[PDB]
Every structure is written in C-alpha cells, then in structure tokens.
C-alpha cells in the first residue's frame, strides 16, 4: 500500500 502523497508521477485523485 504505497503512499499516494509520496508518489509524484501518479495522480492521487481517484477517477
């Protein structure tokens, strides 16, 4: 369960 806020290459907002 990677942290979405840490990810800068993928949109955190769900579809």
């Amino acid at each position, epitope marked *: 369960n990677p942290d979405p806020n840490a990810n*800068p290459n993928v949109d955190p907002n769900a579809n």
Partner: antibody
Amino acid sequence: EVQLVESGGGLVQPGRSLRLSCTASGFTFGDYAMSWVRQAPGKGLEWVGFIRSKANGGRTENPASVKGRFTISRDDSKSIAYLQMNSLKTEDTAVYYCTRVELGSSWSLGYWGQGTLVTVSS
Amino acid sequence: EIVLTQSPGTLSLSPGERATLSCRASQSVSSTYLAWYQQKPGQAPRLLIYGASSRATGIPDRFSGSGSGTDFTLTISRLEPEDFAVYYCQQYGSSPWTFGQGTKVEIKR
C-alpha cells in the same frame, strides 16, 4: 543536455516574502515533476516540496516545516518552476536546489541545479 | 515520518579500499523508493543509484547498492580519489520525503 538554473535568491528581512525561479532547458518540461530541496549552511538536505506534471493533476506536496508558508507552482509556457516563500524566518536561510523528478517506478532526483542562496536576516 | 539514520558519521579510508555505507530506516521501505546521492563541498548533490538496482547515467561500476526492508548499503568496491565526499541516502516512498544526515568519506592518514 538537461539544465536547471535557479534565480531570485539573496538577502531578505524576516517576515518578508521572496519568490525563487527555476528555468529548465534540454528536456520536455511539462512531462516532469519538479521538486525543491534546500540545504542549511553546514547541514544536510531537506525536501521542501514537489509539484506533479499537469498530466498528473499538477498538485503539490509540502512538508510540515514549511506547510502554509511555502507554495510551489509551475509555468509550462516558459518552462519555469516557482517557489513562493512567505513569512521567511532565519531558519529558512539555506541554499535552495531545483531538481527534476525522474519518470517511472522509482522517482529519484535525477538532475540538480547549481542552487541559489537565500539569507533571512535583519 | 520515516527517519533515515546513516552510519558511521565519518568513514576514514584510503584510495584502493572498500567503502560500505549503511542507511537504516525507522520504518520498512521498499528498495524501489530508496536512492543515494553524492555531494562534494561547494557543489550540488548528484544522484548515484536508486531503486532496486538502478544506476544513474554515467556512474562508474564501483558504486553498487543492496538491502531490503530496513537496512540498506551503498558499496564502493575500490575507492578512487574523486570518491571522497559526502553521501546521503533518501527515501521517497513515504510522505514526507526524507534524507539521511549524511556520511562523510575522508582520507585516512
């Protein structure tokens, strides 16, 4: 060749504001996340925020130490990344590096600018 | 917040020796989200290795990395004179992003 040039640093009194600029060249700016890292004199590296590419929402993320005080934006028209710094205190004195976030599964800081010095003193 | 503790603070070696730099994390992080940087005095940091087994472009083969979960290692197989500098580990799989306090590799006399 990937190039990152920081500008807009220098001396500023406590409480005032200052905006740092990062002009990019040698790559497609709009496709990459950009991130700011600062280094206090004689100390280590501290991440002070990144901004995603507009194809990934274009939103930002900031640490608690500068949250509500620092603001990161981008201008894909001119390939410039900005660091808006408000309510500067003496602890914000540091060399501020502009970095490009690498694409893919492992988003490391692949390229760094030479850095610009910001001194917060009265 | 995940804290990266680097050890030792200062590595006193000589050219030709092997350099083993450690970086321990307060929480278990994936190797894909761990990177190592090199900084010489007065110069910007540069990326060396990142992820499970990725090397930055133009980085010599003597730099390598390994580790799983909580203990990671940056290894310089045979130290060159240009390798004496400060090395920071970084995690970016957990917000906020954090760096280690840095390990200095100095010339032994």
